[PDB]
Amino acid sequence: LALSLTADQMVSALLDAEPPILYSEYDSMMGLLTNLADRELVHMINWAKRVPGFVDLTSHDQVHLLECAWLEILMIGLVWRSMEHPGKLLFAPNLLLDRNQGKCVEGMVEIFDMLLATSSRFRMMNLQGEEFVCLKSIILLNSGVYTSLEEKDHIHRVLDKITDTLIHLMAKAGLTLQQQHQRLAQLLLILSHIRHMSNKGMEHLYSMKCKNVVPSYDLLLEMLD
Amino acid sequence: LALSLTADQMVSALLDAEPPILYSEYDPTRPFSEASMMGLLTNLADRELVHMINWAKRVPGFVDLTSHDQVHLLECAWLEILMIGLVWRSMEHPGKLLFAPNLLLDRNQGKCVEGMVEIFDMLLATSSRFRMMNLQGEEFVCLKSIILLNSGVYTFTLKSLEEKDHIHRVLDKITDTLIHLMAKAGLTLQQQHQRLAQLLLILSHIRHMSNKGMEHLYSMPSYDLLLEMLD
Ligand SMILES: C[C@@H]1Cc2c([nH]c3ccccc23)[C@@H](c2c(F)cc(OCCN3CC(CF)C3)cc2F)N1CC(C)(C)F
Numbered sequence: 225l226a227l228s229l230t231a232d233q234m235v236s237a238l239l240d241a242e243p244p245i246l247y248s249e250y251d252s253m254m255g256l257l258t259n260l261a262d263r264e265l266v267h268m269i270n271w272a273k274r275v276p277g278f279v280d281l282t283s284h285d286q287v288h289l290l291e292c293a294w295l296e297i298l299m300i301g302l303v304w305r306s307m308e309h310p311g312k313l314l315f316a317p318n319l320l321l322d323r324n325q326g327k328c329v330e331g332m333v334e335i336f337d338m339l340l341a342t343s344s345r346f347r348m349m350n351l352q353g354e355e356f357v358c359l360k361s362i363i364l365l366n367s368g369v370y371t372s373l374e375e376k377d378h379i380h381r382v383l384d385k386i387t388d389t390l391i392h393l394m395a396k397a398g399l400t401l402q403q404q405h406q407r408l409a410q411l412l413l414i415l416s417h418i419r420h421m422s423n424k425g426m427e428h429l430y431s432m433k434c435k436n437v438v439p440s441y442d443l444l445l446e447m448l449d
Numbered sequence: 450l451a452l453s454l455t456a457d458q459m460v461s462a463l464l465d466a467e468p469p470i471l472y473s474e475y476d477p478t479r480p481f482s483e484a485s486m487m488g489l490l491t492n493l494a495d496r497e498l499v500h501m502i503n504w505a506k507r508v509p510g511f512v513d514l515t516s517h518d519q520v521h522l523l524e525c526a527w528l529e530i531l532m533i534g535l536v537w538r539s540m541e542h543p544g545k546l547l548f549a550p551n552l553l554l555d556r557n558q559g560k561c562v563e564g565m566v567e568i569f570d571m572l573l574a575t576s577s578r579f580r581m582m583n584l585q586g587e588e589f590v591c592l593k594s595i596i597l598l599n600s601g602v603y604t605f606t607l608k609s610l611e612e613k614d615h616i617h618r619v620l621d622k623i624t625d626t627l628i629h630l631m632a633k634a635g636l637t638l639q640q641q642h643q644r645l646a647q648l649l650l651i652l653s654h655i656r657h658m659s660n661k662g663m664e665h666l667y668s669m670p671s672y673d674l675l676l677e678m679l680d
């Protein structure tokens with residue numbers, strides 16, 4: 225049924241599944257970042273269930289995709305909220321942090337710097353929230369797909385649908401065929417830098433280890449049920 | 450002159466710039482041990498690196514960048530570039546990685562190195578996806594150049610933005626080139642968009658593999674080295 229969606233219905237569904245903007249619990253820096261990230265994880269589960277073609281997959285497959293993508297998804301949301309705040313990361317509306325505040329934690333300013341650069345690449349492209357929910361979904365289905373045959377064909381048909389959607393959004397905003405091609409690529413090439421940031425960030429979270437730091441296969445299996 | 454080239458001119462330059470296929474050092478002791486296989490793979494990798502630099506300098510637009518920027522693109526890209534060459538070579542050996550004509554290894558021969566099978570599996574999976582997609586050599590060389598220009602660009606002043614913008618325009622010329630390759634093949638406009646997307650999404654996984662790959666190596670090239678080789 226998700227394969228039957230028009231471009232507009234795809235965006236309407238993705239825009240209507242958006243998670244809400246959470247606030248940072250205080251009224252220690254690793255503490256606020258960690259607690260916030262745990263709380264957005266809960267909302268990300270119910271976001272992912274609403275991504276079209278996601279619940280068409282077995283729960284095993286659903287959780288492998290979330291396991292591979294959760295940090296990328298957390299990060300692309302951070303970068304989106306941060307577009308209109310050059311030089312700062314809008315973790316929460318009461319947690320806007322600058323490059324200098326990354327230095328309070330050994331290891332973080334490197335990820336902080338990569339997130340800022342992605343945020344200004346979205347600013348200098350004037351990334352639209354319709355395109356952004358598209359990329360966020362692309363990340364969900366794409367980042368673990370390559371690890372049975374009916375499942376990865378269906379995922380690749382839904383990913384072909386979101387490509388159609390990105391092209392449609394670009395045609396309706398007036399861009400020529402050529403500008404449509406180029407913008408799609410520039411948007412998708414940024415996903416590979418987002419992958420790099422997730423990997424480096426994952427890497428920091430194990431040196432960071434206060435133990436049981438990262439969402440395990442079984443924890444994620446419970447939250448979707 | 451890079452930004453005036455026609456699609457077919459870009460395909461041409463890229464195809465001639467391809468580095469040769471090399472051979473692994475000849476009759477090592479087999480069966481391998483962990484130290485001897487890592488020794489071969491390393492020595493083969495190092496020898497490919499020299500040819501990669503000559504390759505890099507012939508990628509339209511690369512030599513327009515400052516020495517320092519060229520090195521940084523390479524420091525960030527070189528393992529993805531090594532790994533996509535392997536996947537390409539190994540497309541016609543299902544279940545095998547053709548590291549060299551004389552070094553064709555299956556999954557089980559990757560267990561000889563602790564931590565390596567996990568990497569092996571990823572590389573083989575990618576090679577199977579390129580098979581499933583019927584990846585073309587003309588597309589291959591466009592994606593490789595895309596890797597070289599893109600991976601290091603989000604890490605790069607008036608001059609620094611000119612550097613950034615020029616690279617982004619060359620990437621835009623490589624996109625048009627892939628699209629021309631697809632249009633000329635007879636694919637529809639929708640099919641063109643979808644295949645361009647599927648290919649570019651594959652570069653996200655190639656980035657994952659290079660990162661895990663870099664992790665694996667540490668668990669077991671300098672700026673100065675790449676810069677000397679570049680001049
Ligand atoms: C700055 C980035 C990204 C980031 C962190 N915060 C966020 C909150 C909202 C949006 C983005 C973020 C933070 C971060 C995080 F993303 C996760 C985390 O730990 C989660 C622990 N939970 C146990 C649950 C399993 F059940 C997972 C701790 C963090 F500081 N940071 C990760 C690093 C640099 C280390 F890559």
Ligand SMILES: CC1=C(c2cccc(O)c2)[C@H](c2ccc(I)cc2)Oc2ccc(O)cc21
Pocket residue numbers: 490491493494495497531532534535548564565566568569662663665666
């Ligand atoms: C992908 C890859 C290696 C690889 C890398 C990491 C993990 C792994 O399992 C294999 C390994 C390698 C070994 C040492 C270095 I220095 C670099 C690459 O040997 C290679 C040789 C040639 C080539 O084109 C690719 C590889």
